Nucleic acid binder design. Structure first.
Length: 250
RNA sequence: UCGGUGUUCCCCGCGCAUCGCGGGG
């Protein structure tokens, strides 16, 4: 429900992408959960079993019933990143969503200041934003962007990507709404229109274990929707690294 | 808001379940 954004305004010259900050913070002694890695599995956070009926199939699959979910799985059944490293070309920061994840942001605050000030020299601005996530229907379309939407699969260069992207956004909203016990306005009210899918392109997937041969689809988005979002909402994949950030146009 | 130009390194969810749709880094 409650979000804290630690935001560093970068000096005119210098860039510091979310992934650079993330990797630099990897050199400090921060808990795995800060990087959306489950400390009780050693893997990235992911979902446990949802449907009881699969136990049977699990058993013959593995020779035993499924283990109890990890603490992060019980707390975060949909595997939504409680910590994201976010930013654009002009700023970089750390978004904690939920009181569970606020101590991680605290732990990482001074390391992050060190990293940003070292990389950028003098001039770095800082803000701490507080939001509570909310979603409400409107009578008129509000304009939005999605910065660096990532779709691991299904992003094409042909025009129907516009609707392919729309579906993803909707799913994302539902996903987040379910995660945070928020009520979704009806799809017919939302009336999402992806006005634009800019520069559909590829991006090599790099993980904690190294760069991979999988590429994912990457693109920037303009869309409209009769929706009022409070707080920071995301769509697409790899949002723990700031990808897919929904930005209200002002 | 618009740096990476194109698909598997490994974890997972769901389903009209050697497949199909998705999720995590």
């Amino acid at each position: 429900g409650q979000q804290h954004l630690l935001r560093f305004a970068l000096p005119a010259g210098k860039k510091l992408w979310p992934n650079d900050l993330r990797e630099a913070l990897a050199k400090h002694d921060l808990p795995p959960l800060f990087f959306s890695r489950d400390p009780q599995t050693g893997h990235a956070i992911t979902r446990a079993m949802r449907n009881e009926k699969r136990v049977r199939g699990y058993i013959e699959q593995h020779g035993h019933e499924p283990p109890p979910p990890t603490e992060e799985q019980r707390a975060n059944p949909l595997a939504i990143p409680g910590i994201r490293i976010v930013g654009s070309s002009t700023w970089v920061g750390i978004l904690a969503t939920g009181e569970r994840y606020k101590p991680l942001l605290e732990a990482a605050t001074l390391p992050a200041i060190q990293i940003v000030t070292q990389r950028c020299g003098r001039g770095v601005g800082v803000e701490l934003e507080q939001h509570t996530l909310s979603i409400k229907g409107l009578d008129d379309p509000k304009r939005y962007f999605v910065r660096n939407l990532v779709m691991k699969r299904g992003l094409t260069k042909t025009a129907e990507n516009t609707t392919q992207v729309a579906s993803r956004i909707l799913s994302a909203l539902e996903r987040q709404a379910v995660a945070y016990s928020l009520d979704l306005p009806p799809t017919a009210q939302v009336d999402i229109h992806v006005e634009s899918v800019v520069r559909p392109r590829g991006m090599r997937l790099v993980t904690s274990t190294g760069a991979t041969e999988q590429f994912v689809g990457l693109a920037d988005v303009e869309f409209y929707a009769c929706l009022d979002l409070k707080g920071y909402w995301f769509a697409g994949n790899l949002t723990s690294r700031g990808y897919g950030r929904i930005i209200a146009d002002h």
